[PDB]
Every structure is written in structure tokens, then in C-alpha cells.
Design a binder for this molecule. Structure first.
Ligand SMILES: [Ca+2]
Ligand SMILES: [Ca+2]
Ligand SMILES: [Ca+2]
Ligand SMILES: [Ca+2]
Ligand SMILES: [Ca+2]
Ligand SMILES: [Ca+2]
Ligand SMILES: [Ca+2]
Ligand SMILES: [Ca+2]
Ligand SMILES: [Ca+2]
Ligand SMILES: [Ca+2]
Ligand SMILES: [Ca+2]
Ligand SMILES: [Ca+2]
Ligand SMILES: [Ca+2]
Ligand SMILES: [Ca+2]
Lengths: 424, 424, 424, 424
């Protein structure tokens, strides 16, 4: 009785970009309160669960979420009296109430808010930390963070073709040290940008978008920053890229370094970068429907470098299943709000895990003060998290959460980077 | 017995700039947990309580807070067994244990962390929201926010002399609408900056630092943004400035718009701007110790314009007392970590309130996911809050907290701007 | 405080063979009681955790476990006051107290008894079913059972070379129906054995060991039984074998069907049987250290047939790691008492899961009334369980437990065989 | 209120032979859960309470118990709100709901399941062990076990006429030692069967059915096993027989040792065996309706040997009353499911006790993981239990239960064999 849902309330709040998003509050009969906020970023297309916007041009430029918030009222009517411990029944009941494949009726933002809020309330009722509620007694692995430092493509005003350049402190003895290494490299990068003429204003993720001339200049700048902070590139702090190749792809051709490339040219660019630079991960190296060439890329590089599908997989079990069947990729970016329930997100992580793919638990461009993905990462032993740069607390809050989880785990805490659960 | 302190733990976490800061966790015998994080900004000097840094050049560039964190262990030995409800006795016990005027032995950051954490724990034990625990049954006033949009001086690479230009939605019917107004004007500003080809990278506070030529260009841009969003400058969205005059003051001269001014010239510049632009508030318009000229400024502008002391007062009761006695300023920026206990912060707010000064509850440039200042603002009916722009969740989290307080207050919720508790 | 261990007691009881084994009783301060019994089978050698026997020839033929039972007293001194929820800390404390790699000081049987008992107590304290306590909110998969029906080799008096022939109801819609299918085929087999004048006395696992002439005669008999019960061989009820090849291996030669074979001949026998019979799984098809030939077997059959390591892996993370690296096997038999803690068993299952191996949770030939492996199977979504025939309650009790778990899961219950989590 | 029945649930599970049987789950308002399983063996005739089978040839060969399970739903409607402590009112309410003498409407299996489950729940509510709940503060007597070792008659393929040959460790100082003595003799028997050419496959009860030529060969084999284990036949380990004479009786003649005998011949066979072999008990020595010759047998042997009615009495008060009136038998086999309620079973034990007959609490051929009969034996100070051999955990579980009861009784524990409560 004590864990029965008594109240579900939703509210329009703002995300880290000053845009409306949804929060939900779940109260149980025993007085346990769960509170969760929903992130938001730019949709990739057809398989991403629908973020419901009001499209009222007189409120927040058409980006109000009053309809999503009101839809939580119909979710409250369906869910009152069910046990908060039955996460799966809860999620299945909202999926059935919505009645659409992409959650376009209730809104993925309405549904995910209640899904996460309920989980927080159930963890609190059992007096379990959320990582332990979600993952059981082996939820002890702190992820290697993918830490944004330089942006390009459509995330900048520069001549860098690739979207994001990241550092990964793979060689750190603990998450606490991993975070310090990332932070020292970020501040050494800031000093190197300022010492040159370059802008230090930060984008959505808390990193820099200086006017650089090429991808190579980006990578050489990270290596300069790592060296300046006193770390070995590769063994201690390695590099990773989000290519977001779909952004410079037109009719079988990839436009990169000023030249149009055939798929084999794009693959050769990625191969040359890998053989020169300590790059351990490449996300969306080829476009989201170029499966035959992803096959080639995976056969060629997949042994030595992590190949992450984001747009490729859209946190979708069917798309990940096809990828597994075709030897396409070896990792998947996990975005809760791309699929819209905690349950379906756990099903997708499980499919990836038991097929030998790495799960990288991901933020969106629009984040909140919510830290669920820190707990989700540790609960599923994912071993990797992508949650932005070393500035802006919608990003730092997840690192702070992971410090708290690592301290509570005591002698049981493992760092993915030291036990072979990091990038591969 | 239930409200007795059982445990105080501290940890080194990161602030919104990726710099170390302190958090404290207070547990009571009844199982109530309070958790608080400490902000940080650039110290103003003599009367600012000492933020204790490790000065180990091999960790976080000398900005570790391990010594502060360890000092919470000595605070735990002193405070275990005391009632969490005795905020004042708690704070006085840490002040006495430190034994220095500026808290340089334990660290203001160690002491404030326990002070805020204890208050959060005591509110939770009584099952009271923190605003109501801190302020009693008339804690019902949501503040007018001072929303950063353009930065200059030492917070930019431009030819704007003044540090900060803010919008204040004084004419809004509620905090919920005030926030929407701020957000729409911020996005209309972003569009106007991008349409002119000016940089949209954000600073510490989540606002813009474009390459503008003058203070007048900054104010003209805010007026353009307000008009573009469909709001009336002054009546609906008014302006405020942090001059941080001590940044361009040397040898009794203020350097501003490319000309050296005597104090009377600086005063005339502020007077001219006020008569031309709907500016309702000016912070640090003259340097922090130029009290004779502050007198003149206050006699001249104080009846029509709020004149805020930040560096002027450093949240110090002694300095604010002298300022009240000499007719200097008519408002004070309230920074918890400039004085280092909740108690002394409440004493400073009380002195300002009963002397007819306005209290503007303030962030620091280094913030965290902590939202205490939202509750402190409502608890003291301060009527104003300065917590940054409409981006970055260390700023947005305070707006979200105030949305939550406004909703819980229901029909009792008042907006400072509608009942004469806003800027004056 | 409520989940702190207050009492750990152990007792000498009997297993399903009338041999001494260990049970432990764990009491928490909140009055929660966990009770667990330890199985036993014939040790495989080096990497199997040491089962501590008394070797007093005047008690139970030297197979007393009084020393193991007394050693639980030293475990009680170490563990009193620790939280039952900290399974991993609990297990690590006993591993450290033992101080030997193979647990030969305390006894694997002493340590495992406390490890399982503690987990049962912690599940009861949280009022969680043990499957949900151990696995989180996606613990919803009922395994395909590997049901013993005919025995040979050193488990019989016949001319069948292979140790065990099993039916697997892979095509069943639910575990409840899978069990009924198994039972109907077992009774149809019993009738066919009695009609031919073959012995119906049962062995350790509750199956038959009739005087048959060959492996082929065994498989032909299972096909006859399946057809007689009205089921389709392969699609509905498929076959599996434990070859226990190390029983007929000497000097690089395997003795099978009366002929000496080289490894390539043994592989060809397994290949021929697979192409003729609906065999989906083969356990220990080659001897435990013949890794070069396991490589060949895995390359040849591994895409179409599950190849299970029992003696191959001995539930050891190091051995399973090497097997994964060298493309040896694609499944592992999970025996809690081969490694001696719940934690290390979960680590081994996790390694197998994220490397794309199947975990088959296993009984020992000496079982008890304990049903932990039913919950362990569902908690880890292992998808397969090996717990003996359709007779003897040390076997049936696990099926009954899985009926109880399937009913409690309601609409969330999945059968491994219907969702691709069965043999592959 | 706390001990009121809130929920009664039943389930189809499998017994030790892989045949369906009933389990019931009783929940009280205070959250106490009782769970019980019902055994099954071959009916003796008209006075045995009806085991309800589905007789659906397409499920479990016609031996489903879905109808019995569904009938627990009508029992739930009648019993919800009654106190679990009112065992007798509970049992009388189900007897009245059924409305038939032999429980053929609800099914003895439905009724007994709820009867035992309720008792388990009531013991748990009072935090009393079930033996103490059922028997009061003198429930301290551990029974002498009747341990099956060799089978014949219709339970074997041999030339042994009698059904069962048992060892009874009458001379043991405690139950714990009694169990070790039984176990050592069973393993010494297994070695002696293997050393000769004889089968070691086990039947329903966990004993052996080797191809022996006569009853005398069976008894001589037990004496060989006892001697081999180092025990004195008679004083330490004595013999007992279940003749099941009804199986070789036709029209006043008993067929035994190849010859047809008159009743006086059958009696002389039993007399000769007793004068030669240390036989302390004979069960069903004459057929279930041969009262006049049972009189003679009782007058002749009843002084020196226990004469147990099983088929003779069918756990029936009326039949036991006639037996007491005629000086027929001096012991009764107590089978809960032959009469169908705990209450009527206790009434039958009471009638036997106060008439100077011994109550031997009995398993069925089809057993489960249930251990109620261990507690029933200790509660009624019956002093004897018949629960099978030294293998198969549906048998060993009762011995394990009695180890637990003996340990909890501490210095209060008595062994029936040492205090004159064993066979007589
Ligand atoms: Ca996207
Ligand atoms: Ca796309
Ligand atoms: Ca560009
Ligand atoms: Ca991406
Ligand atoms: Ca300052
Ligand atoms: Ca100063
Ligand atoms: Ca200032
Ligand atoms: Ca073995
Ligand atoms: Ca070996
Ligand atoms: Ca095996
Ligand atoms: Ca019978
Ligand atoms: Ca009969
Ligand atoms: Ca016969
Ligand atoms: Ca009998």
C-alpha cells in the first residue's frame, strides 16, 4: 500500500537553454516524493519519440509545454493506485494510454517525466540510492566521461567540419581523479585559447567554439591542452569525436576539408585521423542510413576504435538489432527521451550489452538540474557517459552526482577505464 | 532528540566554472538529510569572509578545497548532538570554533556549507519548505529577477566599460510570467546579436559579451530586444546595470566612454543615462570607498533610482550600518559566502530591511545546483534576486525553484513588482 | 540500523544424496531471516573453490561439514553490525577473512551459505522478491530449462559414452507450459522405457540410466518420447547434451562409439549428430584444456549450436576471460559453489553477458530444497537453467519457484524461448 | 483483526514424481503468509478422501489439478475475514462448504492445502514455530524415523513379496545421531548393492529396488548393511516392514514365497520372521478387511512387535475406533491427505494416543518441499515418522526440518527412541 502512487503533478520549467520543458512530481501513500526533469535536443528524424510543443507563437516562441504538462493529468488518472515498484507496468500503461508508436499523443516529454519521477520515488520508498534500485548489487561501475571541449559543424562559426571534439580520461585510477584530469585539461585549453586570439564564450554543452581552420587544428589544440596540463595523450587522456556526418552528407557524398568525398574517401579520412591521433571513439562517422559503408568502416576500424551510433540507432531496439545483425557499429548513444520510458531505455541498454556493444549514456543539448543519467550509467554498468564539458551545472551536476555515488560505494567503487569497461 | 545532528560530511565537488567548491551533508537522528553547495566569485578584499583554497599547484591549478572539506570534520566534532533548529547557536558555535573575524581558519566555504546544509535538514525535519522555515507565515513574496543579458568591462572582450546590463520584468503579474518575459527577451536578443554577426557564446552568468562599442550601444540593444519580443521598456521590462566602477577607477578619476572623469562627471554620466533610458537600478556606480561622492549620488538619484552597494557593503553589517548613517546607497547585494553563515546573512538583511534599504539576494559568478537563494529571497520578502541570465542551469535552477515556491504558495503568492517590493 | 546483521548461525544438514552440506541462517535487527543451503557435486580440480569436508572416517564416511559449520562462527564475528544490503562488501569481507584464492581456509561451502543467506535476508527486509532484489526492474525473463532425461558415461551402467541427454522446451509460450511439456515428455519416456523392459530407477538428477547401446540410441529414444507426447522435435522440444568429454579423453584421443578419435574426429562426431538430430546445445564437447580444438569446434559449430563450457570455465572469471579472447565456447555453466560468493557469481554472469555468451544457471548433482538458482536465473535474465529431470523435489522445487516468479510477474513475465534469450 | 484471513490463493505445481498437485497461499491482515503443498499417493479405497483430478487427457496425462486450484477460489469467498487462529472453525467451514463425506466436491487436495497453509500463517502471526503452535509447551519429542532402503511387491521388478523394508535407528541418543546412523547404513547398503551386480537407481521414496529373490534376502541385506556401517541390529538399528498384504491377497488366501497361505500361514510367516530377525514393526501384515485374523495376529505378536494399520485404518476415526474395540493393531499410519483437514488428522492422532496406539506420521509416494509432517510429528509427540529413504529432498527436507526443530528445542529436545516413545 505504502508504495502506491497517490499524486502525479507536472509543471512547465526551463532547461539550460532557457526553453520550456516538463518536470513531474510523484508522491506515494508513504509520503515518498520523486521529482524528475526532461531534457531536449534537436530531433534526428522518424524513430525519435515526439517531444510535444504547444506551437503557441505568443508563448516562448512556440516552445511552451503546457499541453505535455496537462497530459500528465490523464497519466495521473490512469496510474493512481498502481505500485511505484512496478516500473515496467507503469511504463506499459502510459505506452498503451498514448496508443502511438512515437508517443505523439501524450508527448514523450510528459511520459518520460512520470517514468523517471516514479523511479526516483520508488528508490526513496525503499531507502535505496537510484543506481542500486535500477541495477542491483553489482551497480558499482563509474563511467569514463566523454567531455566536450571544442565544437564545430552546425554548433559553431568556424571551418571545423566535425561537430564535437572530446577528451576521455581513460587512464585515471578513479572517477574523482578522471574529473580532476578533465577539469585541468579544460582550464589549460581555456588559457591556450585566450593566449591565441580565440573566443572563450561557451555553447550549450559548456565547451568552446573558437574560429579554427580544420578538424586537424581542433585535435592538435586538444593535444596541446593535454600536454600543457601534464597528461599523456592516449594512455591518460584520449580523444573522441562526434562527426555528426549526416550534417555534411548529400546524395552519397560527404563534404569534409573543403572536398566532396565518396564513402571510401570519408572512411579514409577517419582512418588517417585514427592512425595519427590518439582517437579512441568516433560517433556518427558515416550518415544514419549508410549501412553498407558502416559495415566497411566497422570491419576496417571496429577492432581498434569505438564506433558509436547516435543518429544511426536513435536509442531504438529495431535499428540496434539491424546494426548487430550487419556488424555495424560497436556502441550506441543512449538518450532516454529519444525512446520516452525508463523501461524501453533499459531494454535498449540490455540488447546492446548482451550483443557486446558499449552503451554510452547521453545528455541532450537542452539539459536540466536532473542527474538521472549518472545513476542510469552506474546501474547498467554502461562504463561511459556523455554529459558535456567542464562548465555549466546542467553538466557539472552529473559529475557531482557521480562523485556522490563513488563515495557511497566506498571500497566497492570501480572505474570503467581501469577494468576494461571504457571505450573499445 | 529527533532534530539533533547525528552526522556532518563534506566533499570536494565542482562549481558551474569547473572549479572545486564545498558541499556538506547534515543527517539528523530522525533521518532528515540536508545537502548544500557553496558558490564562489572573485573576492573584493578586506571585509569578504576568506574562501579557503589548498594552493597545491599540482591539483586543480591550486584551487582544491580539501583543507575546507577536512575542516568540516572539526565542525562535526563541535556540532554533533546540537539541535538543527538552533540555526543561530549552530552558526555561533562555528564562528567561535574558527576564532577569526574573516573565517580564515576553518574557511567561510566550510562554515557556510554546514550552515546551509543544517537549515535544509531542519526544514525537512519539520516537513516545512525552506522559505517558510526561514521566514514565517508572511514568506509569500516572489522577487523581481535581475536577469543578466550583456557583459562588458573585465567580464568581456569589448569597448563596454560597465560590467553587466540586466533586464528586470518589473511590470509582470506573477513570477511565472516575469520568467517567460525574461526568456522571450533573451531569445529576441540572441536573434538580434546573430542577425548583426555578433558572437552568441555565453559567459559565467549565461549571457552574451558581443563586441559592442559603448555602454549606450549595450542599452540600445536591450531596448531593441525588449521591443522585438513585444514588451514596453520601463513599464514592463526595465533595465539595471552593475557599473563595477572600481574596475575603471584610478587616482580619483573614472575612465568611461574613453574620457577620464572626476567623481562629479561619473555621477553626471549615471544621471544622463537614467534620464535617457528606463534604468531603475545601478550597482557600484562609484568606487567602494568614495563615500562623500556616494552621498552626492544618493541625494541626486536616490529618490528616483535604486543605488545598490555590492563592493560598497560586501554583505557586512558594520559597513551597511555606516552607509545607512551617512545616507549612502539605498540597496545592498546579499552574498551568503561574503559573510559565511546563514545567521549573519539574515542579520544583514534585517538591518537593511528596517533601515528602508532593499535587499537583492545574489548569486556568485561560480554557482552550483544549490537553490537556497530562491528560498532566502522569499523567506526575507527581499523582493529582488540576482541569479544570472536565461541560460545555464546553475542560474535556471533558481528560477525553477521560485516556480515551485510560487505554485506551493497558491492564492497567497505575491510578485514584488505588483505590490511595491521591487526596485525603488 | 534495521538491515544490520544481528546473527549468523550454520548447521550440518543433508543434501538430496544423503550427504552432509551447510546451511546458514542470517537474522537482521529488523527481524528479517535469510536461510540458504549449499549444493555439492564432484570437483573438476584447480579453479573450483574448495568444499571443506571434515575427513573423519567415523562420521558420514569422512564427509562431515562440522569444520565448515564452525567456520561460520568466525564469519559471524567479522560480519555482525554490517548492512545486509552491502552484498559485495559482505562477500569481500569473507574473501579477505579466508585469505586463500580457492577458499580452502573457511570453506567455499561456509562462505557461500552466508552469502546466499544474507541476500535472502536483505530481499525480505526490503519486502522484495529475491529475483527483483538481485536484478532490478527488468528481472522478468523465465529461463528455458535444460531437463535431464537419459544419463550415460560415469553416471550410468550402459554403453552410452556421453554423460547427459536433455530436452529443452524452446518453443513453449511460457515457463508454465514449458514445464508441462517437459513433464509430459518425461512420462512418455518412462512408459517407452518400461514397455521395452528397461529399468526406471532414477539417478541423482531424477532421470533414467537404462542399459542403452550408444549415444544415437539415447537421442532416438528422446525423439520417440517427444513424438509420443505429441510435440515437434526442434521447433517445440529440442535436445541438448553434456558430453563431459574429459571422462573418455586420454593421450589426445577421445574414445566414443567404441573407436579412438583424434580431436578432429570428436569434432566430426559432434557435427554429424548436430546435422542429424535437433541438438541446440553441447556442453564440454572437448576436454577442458584442449583450447586449440575448442577454437575449431567454435568456428565450425558456434554459429548454429550453443557450445557450453562447464569443466572448460569452472565458473571462473579469468578462464572465461581467456575463452572470450580466444573465440572458445559461446556459453558458460554458472555454479555458485564453484566460485563461492553470490558477488563473484554475478561478476562471472556479467562478463559472459556483455561478451555475448549465454549464462546457463546450474544445479549440482547434490542439491537441496534451496531455490536460489531460480531467482538468480530471472534476476540476471540468463535465459537458461539446468536443474535436473522432472522428478525429485531438489529439482522440482526450482520449477515450482519459477512458477511462483512467473505468476508474481503477471503481464511483465517473458519466456526466454519466445524472445531470443534461449539457446543460440 | 491482524490474524483475519485477507487472501487465499492456490497454484498448480509439481510433486516429487513430476505430477501436478495443489499449493495454497494464505495472507493475514498483519501480512503473515502461510504456504503449503499437498502430497499424493495411490488411494486404498472407499474411506480415503477424494484427490480431485481434472481428467483432461490433453494436460499432464489427465492428472491436472486446475479444478482443485479453482475450488480454492470458493474456499477464499467462505473464509476471508475469519481468524487464522480458529483452525477448527476454518476446517469445519470447508467441510460444510464441500458437503460430502469424502470431500469429492471441493477436493481433499484443495481443502488440505488451505488447512495447512492457514496453520503456517497463524504460527507465523504469533511468531511461534509450527510444532509449538500445534502442540503446546510439551511439543519436544523428535520421532524415530522409519527409513525406506529396499522395495518389493508392486514397487519393484523382483521376487520380494513385501512392499518396503526399513531401518529404524531406535538406539540413537538424539535425532541428529539417528539421521547420521540411517545415512551411514544407506551408503553402506549402496556399496554392498554395487559390489554385487545390483541396480542403485532409486524409486519414489529414495531407496533401492534391486533384483532380490525373497523377503529373507531383503532382510539379510539390511543386516549386512547395518553390520558394514558398524551398528548392532535391533538395539541400535532395527528393521521394519510394510507388508502391504492387500496386494497379494485373493479370496482369503495370501500368496507369499511362491505358495498360497491360509491366514494362519500368513501369521506364521510373520511370526517366523520376527523370531529370526530384529523386526520391531510390521505395517499391513494382513489385508485391510481381515479383522478376525488381525485379532489373532495382535494377540500373538502385539506384545513384542508394533503392528501398524495403514490400508487397515486409512487415517479414519471410525475404522480406528473399530480396531481399538476389537484389539486389532497397536499403531496407525497418519496421512493428512487421506482425511483432508489438519483438524480431523489431529482428532485421529488424539483417538490413537488416548487408546494406547502409536501414531506414525507418514509421507505419500508423491511428496513436495513441504515439511509440515516434521512439525506435526513433534507437536503431537507421535514419536515416529515415515518420510522415505536417505535420498531425494522431498524426503531429506523433513529430516532437515527435524534437525532445525531439535536445535531450536536445545536442552528441551527428547528423542522418542530413548524415552520409550518409539516402536512398541
Ligand atoms: Ca540530434
Ligand atoms: Ca537525421
Ligand atoms: Ca562552419
Ligand atoms: Ca551526436
Ligand atoms: Ca566580487
Ligand atoms: Ca576591496
Ligand atoms: Ca557586482
Ligand atoms: Ca563436476
Ligand atoms: Ca580439472
Ligand atoms: Ca557437466
Ligand atoms: Ca496407498
Ligand atoms: Ca485397498
Ligand atoms: Ca514381483
Ligand atoms: Ca503402506
Amino acid at each position: 500500500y505504502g508504495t502506491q502512487i497517490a499524486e502525479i503533478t507536472a509543471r512547465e520549467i526551463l532547461d539550460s537553454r532557457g526553453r520550456p520543458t516538463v518536470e513531474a512530481e510523484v508522491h506515494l501513500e508513504d509520503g515518498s516524493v520523486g521529482l524528475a526533469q526532461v531534457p531536449s535536443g534537436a530531433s534526428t528524424g522518424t524513430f525519435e519519440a515526439h517531444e510535444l510543443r504547444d506551437d503557441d507563437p505568443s508563448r516562448y516562441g512556440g516552445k511552451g509545454v503546457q499541453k505535455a504538462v496537462e497530459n500528465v493529468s490523464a497519466i495521473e488518472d490512469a496510474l493512481i493506485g498502481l505500485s511505484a515498484l512496478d516500473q515496467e507496468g507503469l511504463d506499459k500503461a502510459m505506452i498503451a494510454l498514448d496508443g502511438t508508436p512515437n508517443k505523439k499523443n501524450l508527448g514523450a516529454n510528459a511520459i518520460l517525466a512520470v517514468s523517471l519521477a516514479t523511479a526516483h520515488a520508488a528508490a526513496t520508498s525503499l531507502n535505496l540510492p537510484l543506481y542500486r534500485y535500477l541495477g542491483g548489487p553489482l551497480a558499482n561501475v563509474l563511467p569514463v566521461p566523454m567531455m566536450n571541449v571544442i565544437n564545430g559543424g552546425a554548433h559553431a562559426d568556424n571551418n571545423v567540419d566535425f561537430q564535437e571534439f572530446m577528451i576521455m580520461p581513460v587512464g585515471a585510477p578513479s572517477f574523482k581523479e578522471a574529473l580532476r584530469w578533465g577539469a585541468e585539461v579544460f582550464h589549460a585549453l581555456a588559457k591556450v585559447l585566450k593566449d591565441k586570439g580565440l573566443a572563450t564564450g561557451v555553447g550549450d554543452e559548456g565547451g568552446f567554439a573558437p574560429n579554427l581552420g580544420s578538424n586537424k587544428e581542433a585535435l592538435e589544440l586538444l593535444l596541446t591542452a593535454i600536454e600543457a596540463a601534464g597528461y599523456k595523450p592516449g594512455e591518460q587522456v584520449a580523444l573522441a569525436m562526434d562527426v555528426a556526418s549526416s550534417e555534411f552528407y548529400k546524395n552519397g557524398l560527404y563534404t569534409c576539408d573543403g572536398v566532396s568525398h565518396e564513402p571510401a574517401g570519408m572512411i579514409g579520412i577517419l582512418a588517417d585521423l585514427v592512425s595519427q591521433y590518439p582517437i579512441v571513439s568516433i560517433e556518427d562517422g558515416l550518415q544514419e542510413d549508410d549501412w553498407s559503408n558502416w559495415k566497411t568502416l566497422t570491419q576496417q576500424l571496429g577492432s581498434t576504435v569505438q564506433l558509436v551510433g547516435d543518429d544511426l540507432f536513435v536509442t531504438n531496439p529495431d535499428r540496434l538489432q539491424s546494426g548487430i545483425e550487419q556488424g555495424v557499429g560497436n556502441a550506441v548513444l543512449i538518450k532516454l527521451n529519444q525512446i520516452g520510458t525508463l523501461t524501453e531505455t533499459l531494454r535498449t541498454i540490455d540488447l546492446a550489452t548482451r550483443s557486446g556493444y558499449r552503451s554510452v549514456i547521453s545528455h541532450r543539448s537542452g539539459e536540466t538540474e536532473d542527474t538521472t543519467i549518472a545513476d542510469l550509467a552506474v546501474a547498467t554498468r554502461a562504463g561511459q557517459i556523455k554529459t558535456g564539458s567542464l562548465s555549466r551545472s546542467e553538466r557539472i551536476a552529473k559529475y557531482n552526482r557521480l562523485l556522490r555515488i563513488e563515495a557511497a560505494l566506498g571500497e566497492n567503487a570501480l572505474y570503467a577505464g581501469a577494468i576494461g569497461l571504457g571505450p573499445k
